[PDB]
Design a protein around this ligand. Structure first.
Ligand SMILES: CCCCCCCCCCCCCCCCCC(=O)OC[C@H](COP(=O)([O-])OCC(O)COP(=O)([O-])OC[C@@H](COC(=O)CCCCCCCCCCCCCCCCC)OC(=O)CCCCCCCCCCCCCCCCC)OC(=O)CCCCCCCCCCCCCCCCC
Ligand SMILES: COC1=C(OC)C(=O)C(C/C=C(\C)CC/C=C(\C)CC/C=C(\C)CC/C=C(\C)CC/C=C(/C)CC/C=C(\C)CC/C=C(\C)CC/C=C(\C)CC/C=C(\C)CCC=C(C)C)=C(C)C1=O
Ligand SMILES: CCCCCCCCCCCCCCCCCC(=O)OC[C@H](COP(=O)([O-])OCC[N+](C)(C)C)OC(=O)CCCCCCCCCCCCCCCCC
Ligand SMILES: CCCCCCCCCCCCCCCCCC(=O)OC[C@H](COP(=O)([O-])OCC[N+](C)(C)C)OC(=O)CCCCCCCCCCCCCCCCC
Ligand SMILES: CCCCCCCCCCCCCCCCCC(=O)OC[C@H](COP(=O)([O-])OCC[N+](C)(C)C)OC(=O)CCCCCCCCCCCCCCCCC
Ligand SMILES: CCCCCCCCCCCCCCCCCC(=O)OC[C@H](COP(=O)([O-])OCC[N+](C)(C)C)OC(=O)CCCCCCCCCCCCCCCCC
Ligand SMILES: CCCCCCCCCCCCCCCCCC(=O)OC[C@H](COP(=O)(O)OCCN)OC(=O)CCCCCCCCCCCCCCCCC
Ligand SMILES: CCCCCCCCCCCCCCCCCC(=O)OC[C@H](COP(=O)(O)OCCN)OC(=O)CCCCCCCCCCCCCCCCC
Ligand SMILES: CCCCCCCCCCCCCCCCCC(=O)OC[C@H](COP(=O)(O)OCCN)OC(=O)CCCCCCCCCCCCCCCCC
Ligand SMILES: CCCCCCCCCCCCCCCCCC(=O)OC[C@H](COP(=O)(O)OCCN)OC(=O)CCCCCCCCCCCCCCCCC
Ligand SMILES: CCCCCCCCCC(=O)OC[C@H](COP(=O)(O)OCCC(C)C)OC(=O)CCCCCCC
Ligand code: SF4
Ligand code: SF4
Lengths: 186, 174, 102, 315, 117, 70, 66
């Protein structure tokens, strides 16, 4: 066993602290590993072993990676089971949106209900953080499971109220399943 | 025909080499010059050994000289001239025409090739570079080879003495 | 194993050299007969071509002998250019440019 | 000389050039597939059927992208150097030992050394003429690399030649009829593998085209055809030294498919060293090829001089 | 060697046709002012690459040239062993390699194979 | 997994086997001999001169039918 | 003392020096074995050599078995 240059304390580990052995056996061992490339052959052997492993690649888009029910993606505006939109224009989500992406303008609707007339989300100012999901008292705005929504144009990444309502209508089943399987964590 | 073509190319590249101010123009001109000189030297000997040796020598030499180009006179202007291009083109086409209208038996070299030697020469039937390079390692002239080993060692000692490595690297305005 | 392999290669080389040594005398006999025939043809052609030149003599440079201090009936081997002095470039490139083309 | 020869020499040389070029393309495919499989990931699989026409994707794109007309460069010297690089990297392949008479290279080692010295001349001309600081640094690194490995490459070759007695590489076939030379020359199997990576500018000696020390090395100003011919020149050099590892150390027979299987294996070894070992510094390369490789080459040359005198007395 | 000249000219011709076909089939876009500029990792250069470069391995390069012409005298003696006196050949060969080892180990002892710095 | 490396390698194995074996056909189409004559040694070149002197085809062999009956 | 330092720091030089010393010993053995017998008068001779019976080189010709 090689000796220690500095005696280690309790609870500490010293690296590069072992003195090189000056006896003939260790010098011949390191000399044979020098001129015959011992560690190079060991690294080549490890690499040739990992050639024979199974790849971790997944066949996108036929195979998609694992996710979670809490996953943060595209913002969406849910509706009630009766069909009425859930949002009641309270502007908590825009008050907590830390990059100020949401813009809400509201007035009294013709039936007297408190509703929005403008719910804009700058998706290029969003950071997909779920503060609007936590701030929403009636569970209207959520982060949908969608993340394949790359656009060719910068204007398509500025969501209107109608685009968010269409996302809420389209992604309703998976959002309902995620909020069924996630609501007692929150 | 190829020998007269090499004559014309060597003449044209020598005219180009006498007229080039920039060291890299001289380097490329002497690259194509040593290519043509290596082929021409080969034509004269039975074997093709010394052309190969001269090519390793003159590619081991200018490899260093480019580093001294990039260290000293790295910044110097190239100047193409239409007069030199017209002169080289006219002389080159004139010598290809003159070589085409020439009798190539009279203009051929009288030095004996491996096939120009007669059949009765039993020394020609050996391995092609044996008897030519024999006297480097034979008894009368091994001592000249000994002198060349000691001369190269003394050359290396001279190079180490007059290129002091501990004075620092070399550049312009050091 | 390399020593045994070198023994085998030396045996093959010695067999090839023995084949060369047993084939060569027929070839050099044909060479000297064709060489004497072509020397007679060249001496006849030089006498035919140089009949108009007054100072020319056959086999001498304007009467001066090429080789002295020799017996009167000796034969020195002529150079490659005098052997092909009555031929086109195709024969000179046929003989001299054997190694350089292949 | 018979007329048909010239025709068949021309045909065989042109067929060899075409097959080496398509094998360069499939060597890029082989490196991109097994070098992925060196790691966990896969190679190219989507394009074409199973990634087989992927070098055709790489060759269609590089032959159509815009040619760079750089500002401060000498363009008349910048345009010509990759042409000469591919010309010498395909011209070195005429030295291949054919069992038919392709070319009677009696001095094949000297021809190999001449084309080896000329390929780095094209590299260092292309590095200077780009007029970029990274290109000049990659060019000077290539010159320091060839000054490091050139005399070591020559003396190591001489030791193999001594076991042959002639400079004709087809005489490697007669001396390897009983066994390969990997048994005798295993320390120079390692040393010639080290030199052959420095010859082809490949990892661990990749200073002429560095992706982290420099930015692409001397290829920083080359695009869309100049980079293509430089890249095929480098990979044809890789194929040539894989072939020379198969000639000297392994069986020199060419009528067996096992020779080309071995050549594909040595090319896989060339990819395999790149995917395992980190790069050196060229300071340590110059301290390696001058104090270790050259000294070992001279010493084992002395060993072969004594062994050849011992063998000659026994015969 | 005459065939090697012709096939070298043919390889040079084929590579020039390949490069000209790459230039002809390339996309022809208009040259911008700052497209042609040297790269220099995305910023202005401050200095041309024609500025003089410091050489720290000048002694190693001249020792390389001396050792390469020493290589040019080793290459004969493969052939000369079968056709010469064995005693004279061994005295020349072992004395050649031992003189090279004295020179290389002496400059290793002085440290002249280390880069100037 | 790992067998997909073998597509892309056999093509390097096959195509580099092309320029030898094809000449082993392409000589036999026109020369008639699969091995054209080697010119390494001087004696082989001199005997090639002898064959090309005897016949226009140096690879056409003069057997014992050339020799007259006596 | 100095052999352990050279075998620790530069072991390839020590292995090469052992190989070169073995080569020098084998060169001495090969030269002594070549000149112990009649090595200058080789069994197979290059070229086609013919000697007359009264020549002094005639009785030096070997008559061994292949
Ligand atoms: C006795 C026998 C011997 C007698 C010798 C006497 C002659 C020599 C005396 C020299 C005296 C002297 O000092 O002279 C200096 C004097 C001044 O020189 P300069 O030219 O002013 O300055 C040159 C620069 O300094 C140069 O400076 P630089 O270094 O910056 O220049 C860069 C250099 C850079 O040059 C290079 O890098 C060299 C390149 C060489 C290869 C090029 C290949 C191209 C292939 C296509 O470029 C050149 O040199 C131009 C080369 C252009 C290409 C030439 C192509 C043909 C030759 C090919 C050779 C073989 C290679 C083939 C390829 C091989 C491939 C493996 O020279 C002359 O005056 C030249 C002679 C001109 C005579 C008159 C010519 C004819 C009349 C012209 C006008 C016609 C008008 C017609 C009007 C019609 C309508 C009215
Ligand atoms: C921590 O801090 C840091 C950051 O902050 C956070 C950063 O952000 C970053 C920045 C990093 C990133 C942004 C991403 C990380 C980067 C990487 C992971 C890069 C590393 C990965 C690689 C380098 C890839 C692995 C390497 C491989 C696979 C080697 C191969 C690679 C190639 C590119 C080769 C492909 C090129 C080719 C094929 C050239 C094409 C040419 C041809 C095909 C020509 C061939 C021709 C033929 C085959 C046919 C021609 C035939 C002819 C002409 C004749 C035919 C004639 C006939 C008649 C038939 C860093 C570093 C950092 O640290
Ligand atoms: C060995 C392989 C070499 C591979 C590269 C070959 C390059 C050939 C360039 C031919 C240029 C011909 C010419 O007219 O040049 C004048 C020109 C003049 O420059 P110019 O910019 O005035 O030319 C432009 C001309 N018009 C306007 C008509 C388009 O110079 C060059 O092109 C520069 C030549 C540089 C040569 C570098 C040689 C390096 C040698 C290194 C080893 C020796 C040390
Ligand atoms: C070695 C290979 C060198 C390169 C050979 C050429 C490129 C590779 C083959 C063509 C491209 C891949 C095949 C393809 O796209 O087929 C689809 C097309 C047919 O598909 P399609 O485009 O009509 O329809 C789409 C496919 N479905 C119906 C499933 C939606 O195939 C062809 O047109 C046939 C082409 C010739 C195939 C010859 C046999 C090849 C066998 C494998 C060789 C490896
Ligand atoms: C393995 C090696 C393969 C080497 C070749 C790889 C590619 C082969 C297959 C693709 C061929 C593409 C040819 C055209 C390339 C340039 C395209 C382009 O921009 O064209 C614009 C030009 C001009 O059209 P334009 O009006 O759009 O151009 C104006 C300028 N820009 C580009 C800025 C808008 O189109 C042509 O020149 C048409 C040529 C038609 C014939 C092409 C050759 C056919 C045979 C090959
Ligand atoms: C199927 C094949 C699988 C394997 C394929 C791959 C093959 C192996 C790898 C090939 C090359 C890989 C790329 C290049 C790697 C280069 C590594 C390198 O050189 O690093 C520098 C390092 C440096 O050594 P270091 O790492 O110890 O550094 C400390 C020492 N200083 C600083 C002084 C140098 O290694 C060497 O240089 C080792 C020597 C290499 C040359 C071999 C000499 C052998 C001498 C003869 C032995 C004699 C034995 C005794 C005989 C007795 C007889 C009586
Ligand atoms: C030069 C190279 C010529 C051969 C390669 C190009 C032609 C074949 C090809 O790839 O055609 C494109 C298309 C396949 O489309 P791709 O996107 O490659 O497939 C992804 C799914 N694996 O494949 C097809 O459309 C198949 C039909 C055309 C095949 C032509 C093959 C000869 C050209
Ligand atoms: C060993 C050392 C040897 C040394 C000597 C070697 C000498 C080799 C011969 C040299 C000849 C030189 C001729 C030069 C002509 C062009 C000169 C030039 O500079 O052209 C410039 C041009 C555009 O460049 P530019 O806009 O100036 O940008 C630089 C700005 N910094 O540049 C270009 O456009 C690039 C060049 C394009 C050329 C295209 C030619 C036309 C097409 C030809 C036919 C192609 C056919 C292909 C298909 C064939 C099918 C069978
Ligand atoms: C004819 C040509 C011109 C004349 C000849 C020119 C070249 C002469 C070369 C030999 C000179 C010998 C006389 C000078 C000796 C100077 C001191 C010296 O080199 O000592 C040997 C030295 C000792 O080893 P060292 O590295 O000091 O180890 C540390 C141990 N405490 O270092 C060593 O042992 C290693 C190096 C020894 C020398 C090279 C190998 C022999
Ligand atoms: C038949 C007649 C022969 C006559 C002589 C022929 C030529 C010589 C043949 C070989 C003889 C041994 C040569 C030993 C010296 C080798 C050069 C050397 O060691 O240089 C000193 C070196 C300087 O260090 P540097 O290179 O700058 O960098 C640090 C290391 N990389 O510093 C170091 O590397 C430090 C290590 C110690 C250096 C001195 C060690 C000397 C040991 C000598 C005996 C052991 C070697 C042989 C053992 C096996 C013998 C079979
Ligand atoms: C553009 C040229 C680039 C440089 C080529 C350098 C080749 C090696 C140096 C040399 O002299 O080699 C001698 C060799 C001598 O031939 P070898 O002895 O190699 O083979 C005999 C030859 C038909 C038996 C094998 O010649 C060549 O390599 C020809 C070069 C052609 C150059 C064409 C353009 C002028
Ligand atoms: S996820 Fe965060 S950044 Fe995006 S809209 Fe909701 S609160 Fe704003
Ligand atoms: S927090 Fe919910 S209910 Fe309130 S304004 Fe935002 S989306 Fe509407």
């Amino acid at each position: 066993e090689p000796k220690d240059i500095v005696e280690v304390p309790k609870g500490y580990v010293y690296v590069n602290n072992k003195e090189l052995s000056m006896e003939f056996a260790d010098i011949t061992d390191r000399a044979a590993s020098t001129m015959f490339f011992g560690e190079l052959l060991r690294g080549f052997a490890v690499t040739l072993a990992h050639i024979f492993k199974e790849p971790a690649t997944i066949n996108y888009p036929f195979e998609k990676g694992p996710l979670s029910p809490r996953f943060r993606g595209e913002h969406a505006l849910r509706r009630y089971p009766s069909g009425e939109e859930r949002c009641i224009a309270c502007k908590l989500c825009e008050a907590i949106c830390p990059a100020q992406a949401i813009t809400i303008e509201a007035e009294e609707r013709a039936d007297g209900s408190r509703r929005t007339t403008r719910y804009d989300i700058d998706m290029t100012k969003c950071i997909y953080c779920g503060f609007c999901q936590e701030a929403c008292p009636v569970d209207a705005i959520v982060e949908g499971p969608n993340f394949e929504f790359s656009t060719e144009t910068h204007e398509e990444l500025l969501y209107n109220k109608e685009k968010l309502l269409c996302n809420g209508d389209k992604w309703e089943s998976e959002i309902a399943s995620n909020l069924q399987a996630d609501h007692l964590y929150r | 025909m190829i020998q007269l073509m090499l004559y014309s190319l060597i003449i044209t590249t020598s005219i180009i080499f006498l007229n080039m101010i920039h060291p890299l123009a001289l380097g490329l001109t002497l690259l194509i010059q040593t290519i043509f000189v290596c082929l021409l030297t080969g034509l004269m000997t039975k074997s093709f050994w010394y052309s190969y040796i001269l090519f390793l020598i003159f590619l081991g030499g200018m490899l260093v000289l480019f580093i001294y180009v990039t260290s000293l006179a790295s910044n110097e202007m190239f100047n193409l001239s239409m007069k030199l291009t017209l002169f080289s083109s006219l002389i080159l086409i004139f010598m290809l025409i003159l070589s085409f209208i020439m009798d190539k038996t009279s203009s051929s070299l009288f030095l004996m090739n491996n096939d120009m030697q007669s059949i009765i020469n039993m020394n020609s039937y050996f391995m092609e570079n044996s008897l030519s390079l024999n006297k480097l390692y034979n008894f009368p002239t091994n001592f000249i080879t000994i002198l060349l080993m000691n001369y190269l060692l003394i050359t290396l000692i001279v190079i180490v003495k007059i290129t002091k490595l501990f004075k620092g690297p070399i550049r312009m305005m050091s | 194993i390399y020593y045994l392999t070198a023994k085998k290669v030396k045996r093959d080389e010695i067999e090839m050299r023995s084949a060369q040594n047993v084939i060569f005398p027929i070839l050099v006999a044909e060479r000297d007969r064709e060489f004497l025939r072509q020397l007679r043809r060249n001496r006849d052609e030089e006498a035919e071509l140089m009949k108009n030149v007054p100072g020319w003599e056959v086999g001498t440079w304007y009467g001066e002998p090429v080789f002295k201090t020799l017996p009167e009936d000796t034969l020195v081997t002529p150079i490659f250019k005098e052997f092909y002095a009555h031929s086109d470039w195709k024969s000179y490139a046929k003989r001299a440019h054997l190694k350089l083309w292949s | 000389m018979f007329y048909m020869e010239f025709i068949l020499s021309l045909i065989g040389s042109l067929l060899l050039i075409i097959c080496v070029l398509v094998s360069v393309a499939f060597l890029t495919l082989l490196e991109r597939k097994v070098l992925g499989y060196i790691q966990i990931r896969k190679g190219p699989n989507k394009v074409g059927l199973m990634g087989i026409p992927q070098p055709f994707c790489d060759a269609i794109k590089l032959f159509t992208k815009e040619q760079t007309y750089p500002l401060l460069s000498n363009y008349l010297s910048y345009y010509i150097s990759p042409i000469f690089s591919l010309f010498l990297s395909l011209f070195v392949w005429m030295c291949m030992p054919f069992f038919v008479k392709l070319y009677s290279f009696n001095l094949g080692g000297l021809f190999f050394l001449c084309c080896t010295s000329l390929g780095v001349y094209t590299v260092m001309v292309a590095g200077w003429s780009s007029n970029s600081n990274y290109a000049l640094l990659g060019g000077l690194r290539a010159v320091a690399q060839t000054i490091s490995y050139e005399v070591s490459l020559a003396l190591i070759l001489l030791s193999f030649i001594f076991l042959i007695g002639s400079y004709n590489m087809i005489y490697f076939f007669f001396y390897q009829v009983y066994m390969w030379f990997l048994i005798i020359l295993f320390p120079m199997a390692l040393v010639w593998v080290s030199i052959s990576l420095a010859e082809t500018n490949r990892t661990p000696f990749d200073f002429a085209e560095g992706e982290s020390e420099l930015v692409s090395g001397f290829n920083v100003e080359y695009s869309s055809g100049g980079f293509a011919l430089i890249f095929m020149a480098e990979y044809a050099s890789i194929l040539f030294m894989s072939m020379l590892f198969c000639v000297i150390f392994l069986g020199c027979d060419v009528f067996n498919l096992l020779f080309y299987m071995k050549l594909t294996f040595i090319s896989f070894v060339f990819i395999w060293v790149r995917g395992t070992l980190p790069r050196f510094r060229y300071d340590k390369l110059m301290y390696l090829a001058w104090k270790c490789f050259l000294s070992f080459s001279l010493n084992y040359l002395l060993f072969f001089i004594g062994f050849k005198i011992l063998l000659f007395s026994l015969l | 060697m005459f065939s090697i000249i012709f096939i070298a000219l043919l390889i040079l011709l084929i590579t020039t046709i390949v490069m000209f076909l790459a230039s002809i089939l390339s996309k022809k876009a208009l040259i911008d002012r700052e497209k042609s500029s040297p790269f220099e990792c995305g910023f202005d250069p401050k200095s041309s690459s024609r500025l003089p470069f410091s050489l720290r391995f000048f002694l190693i390069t001249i020792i390389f040239l001396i050792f390469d012409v020493e290589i040019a005298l080793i290459l004969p003696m493969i052939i000369i062993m079968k056709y010469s006196n064995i005693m004279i050949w061994t005295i020349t060969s072992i004395i050649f390699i031992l003189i090279l080892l004295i020179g290389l180990y002496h400059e290793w002892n002085q440290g002249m194979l280390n880069w100037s710095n | 997994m790992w067998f997909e490396i073998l597509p892309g390698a056999v093509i390097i194995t096959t195509l580099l086997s092309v320029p030898i074996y094809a000449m082993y056909g392409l000589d036999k189409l026109m020369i008639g001999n699969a091995f054209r004559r080697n010119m390494d040694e001087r004696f082989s070149r001199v005997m090639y001169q002898r064959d090309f002197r005897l016949t226009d085809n140096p690879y056409k062999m003069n057997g014992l039918e050339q020799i007259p009956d006596e | 003392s100095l052999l352990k330092r050279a075998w620790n720091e530069i072991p390839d030089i020590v292995g090469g020096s052992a190989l070169a010393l073995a080569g020098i010993v084998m060169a001495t053995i090969g030269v002594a074995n070549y000149y112990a017998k009649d090595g200058d008068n080789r069994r197979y001779k290059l070229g086609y050599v013919v000697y007359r019976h009264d020549d002094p080189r005639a009785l030096k010709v070997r008559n061994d078995e292949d």
